[PDB]
Structure formats: C-alpha cells, structure tokens
Homo-oligomer: A and B are copies of this chain.
C-alpha cells in the first residue's frame, strides 16, 4: 500500500474539529504546514504514549484543491451539495481545510491545534472550532449509544479507503462534516419508547428494534442502504457531542468517512428528502444542521512529499 492517515482511529473521548478557509496568498504557508503535519502529530503525541492516542486527519476541499495542487483531482471531490428538502435543509458552508484532531484527553488535541494554527497565522480564516467530548458510555447528546454499527477491521478498510477505482489517490478518503444543534427540551418531552422509535434502537440496552416494528422514518431505517452489489453500503462515523450550558447549545458534530462521497450523499438525501415510505428522518425534527462541508483526506505519503 501507501500509508493512509489515521482515519481508522481507536476509540477516543476528545476531539477538536477545525475548519478554515485559505486567504489570498495563503497557499505557500499552507503547503509548508501540510508537509509537516505528520511530524507535528508525533512531536506533540509521542511523549504522551501510550494513553495519549493523539491523531490528526487533514482534509482539503474542492476549490482549495485547485489552488494548492496541479495535476489530477480525486475522482469524487466536489463542493458539498445543499439539500433543500420539503421541511428540512442540509446547508453548505465554506471550508478549505479540515483538521480532525482526536485523543484520549482534550489538552493533547489543543496542543496540536495550537501548533497547527501557529504555523497558519496570517494565511487562513477560522470558520468553525468545536471541542467535542464523548459521554462516559459512548452516548451522544440524545442519550443513545452512538457508534455501535460502525464497520471494523477489514470491512472498515474496504468501506473507507480509496482503492483501485482511483489509484493515484489510494489510501485517501472522503469526509463529510455537519454541525447539528439539538432542541433538547423537545427531545426530553418524548417518552423513552417514542425516542426509540425515532432512532430505531433500544435506549438502555442498545439492541436494534426488529424489522417488524422499526418505523420506516427511523434514523437507522433511513441510513441503511444496499448497493447495486446487494451488499450493505457502510460509512465510518465519529460523532461527538459539544455544547455550552450558558448559551443553551447542545450539539452533535457529525463526521462521516467513506471511499466515495456517493455513499454519504445518498444517506443524506434519504434523511433530508425522504423516500417513498418516509417524509424524512425523524431525528431532523430534533436536530438542525448549521454547517456542511466535504473534504478529501489524502494518503499520508501524499502530504509528506511537498
């Protein structure tokens, strides 16, 4: 192979998501940083082994790709597509670079973020900064276990990493991000049985509701899709809660990785636009998307060589 970035990371309990745009003239500064970001990851992380588990995944948007590089583009790379649904909208917001920084402790994330933004001062404009924290039993802001059906091992490699279909960019992946805010008051007004019907799984035990009872507009129903192959289409997610109690913000930061954006984009269409049997994903009646961006996360080797 070539070495991929740390897309398949161990379970980590803290994250920083940084989205920036590249200012006029910024391209050179950015190119230098990209070639050093792996060694900054080691500088910050190595001394905190082995509990640290610090990783940084760097992604580049469609328009930024063309400013930074010439030659081939990854096959799937385009701007995030707005979805204007009957009721709900998936918005598009600007973002040229993504840093998805993960570790077992927030401070490690922050130390690496500090170093990266230190090198980019003057070249970039911050668009989003989120400090995420996992709840102690892998629960999210809605109180459900979040992560359970993610693929693992070889299945994950198959679902997430670009291969032979675009061989110049093998080891890469496509990341979609959306920042969601929740109406927790509304959510907390449902009974548990009602909430389970929205998600499609049991709250306490995390056992999937049987097909005979799981609503067609439940989240798990609409995000299960089968390919042309008859095989299930999979993504790798690492959703993180965030918020502020003083400003009444409670949020889920969605990030989904896939070997092609077509998979992630299909799931999004089903959620926002609905199907024959479902107006839309019921989870969107409690969750509003306020950002939306798409990035390509190259193989590690690609970045080293600049």
A: residues with CB less than 8 A from B are 1, 3, 10-11, 13-14, 16, 18, 20, 39-40, 42-44, 46-50, 52, 105-108, 110-111, 113-117, 121, 126, 128-129, 131, 133-139, 143, 145, 147-149, 153-155, 191-193, 201, 203-208, 241, 243-248, 250
| Chain B residues, CB < 8 A from A48 | 136-137
Contacts A11-B50, A191-B191, A192-B191; A136 near B107 (Cβ below 8 A): yes
A243→B18 CA distance, assembly (Å): 14
Contacts A3-B154, A3-B155, A247-B126; A50 near B117 (Cβ below 8 A): no
Inter-chain contact A207/B10, CB cutoff 8 Å? no
The 8 Å CB contact of A136, one of B108, B117, B155, is B108
Contacts A107-B133, A108-B136; A204 near B203 (Cβ below 8 A): yes
Contacts A105-B13, A192-B203, A246-B126; A208 near B43 (Cβ below 8 A): yes
Inter-chain contact A206/B1, CB cutoff 8 Å? no
Number of copies: 6
A52→B111 CA distance, assembly (Å): 24
Residue in A13, A149, A206 whose Cβ sees the most chain B Cβ within 10 Å: A206
Q: Can you show 26 pairs from A to B with CB atoms below 8 A apart?
A: A1-B154, A3-B155, A11-B50, A18-B246, A43-B205, A43-B206, A43-B207, A44-B206, A46-B145, A46-B206, A47-B137, A106-B106, A107-B133, A107-B134, A107-B241, A110-B135, A113-B245, A114-B243, A114-B245, A115-B207, A116-B245, A117-B245, A117-B246, A129-B244, A129-B245, A192-B203
Rounded to whole Å, the gap between the CB of A269 and the closest CB of chain B is: 25
Inter-chain contact A243/B110, CB cutoff 8 Å? yes
A192→B133 CA distance, assembly (Å): 27
The 8 Å CB contact of A47, one of B106, B115, B138, is B138
| Chain B residues, CB < 8 A from A47 | 136-139, 145, 148, 206
Contacts A40-B207, A143-B204, A246-B129; A11 near B115 (Cβ below 8 A): no
Contacts A11-B50, A115-B207, A148-B46; A136 near B105 (Cβ below 8 A): yes
Rounded to whole Å, the gap between the CB of A210 and the closest CB of chain B is: 9
| Chain B residues, CB < 8 A from A147 | 46
Rounded to whole Å, the gap between the CB of A94 and the closest CB of chain B is: 14
| Chain B residues, CB < 8 A from A204 | 143, 192, 203-204
Nearest neighbor of A192 in chain B, beta-carbon distance: B192
| Chain B residues, CB < 8 A from A52 | 136
The 8 Å CB contact of A50, one of B10, B136, B208, is B10
